[PDB]
């Protein structure tokens, strides 16, 4: 698996639609593309798409961030706790 290159393609793919959408800014955390958001709303994402292939039989992973006055919050849970093993 050439994960670093797939992530990078996705990072360019990410900046492409952040600009279309634009509260918290659209952002790329180096794992996930976060569609920009209003203060007070919560965005869920799933584990990176690579894992659909790496561990096919596991698909319950969710990661959340809140958009606050102080910008995006930390991931919850952390990517290690929600997408690692």
């Amino acid at each position: 698996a050439h994960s670093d290159g797939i992530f990078k393609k996705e990072q360019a793919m990410c900046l492409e639609k952040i600009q279309r959408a634009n509260g918290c800014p659209g952002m790329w955390d180096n794992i996930t593309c976060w569609k920009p958001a209003h203060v007070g709303e919560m965005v869920l994402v799933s584990c990176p798409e690579l894992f659909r292939i790496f561990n096919p039989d596991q698909d319950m992973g969710v990661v959340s961030r809140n958009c606050t006055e102080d910008g995006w919050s930390e991931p919850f849970p952390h990517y290690f706790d929600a997408c690692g093993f």
């Binding site: 994960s3 992530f7 690579l50 790496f54 991931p75 990517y79 290690f80 690692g84 093993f85």
Partner: protein
């Protein structure tokens, strides 16, 4: 280099070592323990 930084780095390091997925999980399990220990 924060929790998220280390997970991305973990992914790419393990994805390069492992050629079977169960090797991948193991290297990834190890990368989580390094993260918690640190």
């Amino acid at each position: 280099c924060d929790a998220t930084c280390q997970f991305r780095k973990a992914i790419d390091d393990c994805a390069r070592q492992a050629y079977h997925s169960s090797v991948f999980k193991a290297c990834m399990k190890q990368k989580k323990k390094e993260w918690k220990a640190g």
